[PDB]
Design a protein around this ligand. Structure first.
Ligand SMILES: [Ca+2]
Length: 215
């Protein structure tokens, strides 16, 4: 159906049902290949996973350049890269899902719009309306630029990314911190999703993922 799938939903539509690594072609262009991890099972499948935490073996306390280009293994812990996320979210309207787990407990948050702006606009976050079980901890970050420890774009007098061991669309400073320090229970420094587990619990497994709206 789609000779050059531009996301995981188009792969799913072609008949590919197994989660794993797929090439997607941005704007359907053969020359714009990007390797991604497709979640083909959650809520019907078709998701591009663009962030994962699961074991703490990958350092996330990186700099702007690293968050721009991406790092990590898409089969393990990684960040797809802010330029890539901007390009994907510019090719249509995407929804965001955040899946989180703590042992046998699980929760999710979904937003019916998701985009980041370009480099010049500091990758500002845009999210739609919320539904789910984890609580809405991301709307606090609506409209905010991205910040890293070496590039403070937040509206705190402090450096949020340095103080809270992360990289995020910080304001003053956060309700979620999913690029924070793995396993870190000190208040607001770990992998927090406030409305699910507060600021003194670091979530051991999180995935951030996106699929075309109303798929
Ligand atoms: Ca600041």
């Amino acid at each position: 159906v789609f000779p050059h799938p531009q996301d995981c939903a188009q792969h799913l539509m072609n008949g590919d049902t197994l989660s794993g690594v797929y090439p997607i072609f941005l704007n359907g262009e053969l020359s714009q290949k990007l390797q991604v991890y497709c979640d083909m099972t959650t809520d019907g499948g078709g998701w591009i996973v663009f962030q994962r935490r699961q074991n703490g073996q990958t350092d996330f306390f990186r700099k702007w350049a690293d968050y721009r280009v991406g790092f990590g293994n898409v089969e393990d812990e990684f960040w797809l890269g802010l330029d890539n996320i901007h390009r994907i979210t510019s090719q249509g309207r995407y929804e965001l899902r955040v899946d989180m787990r703590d042992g046998q407990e699980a929760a999710f948050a979904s937003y019916d719009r998701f985009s980041v702006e370009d480099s010049r606009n500091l990758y500002k976050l845009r999210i739609g309306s919320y539904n789910g079980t984890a609580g809405d901890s991301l709307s606090y970050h609506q409209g905010r630029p991205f910040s890293t420890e070496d590039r403070d774009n937040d509206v705190a007098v402090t450096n949020c990314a340095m103080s809270y061991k992360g990289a995020w669309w910080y304001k003053n400073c956060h309700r979620t911190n999913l690029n924070g320090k793995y396993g870190e229970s000190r208040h607001s420094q770990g992998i927090n999703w406030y409305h699910w587990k507060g600021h003194e619990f670091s979530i051991p497994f999180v995935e951030m993922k996106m699929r075309p709206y109303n798929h």
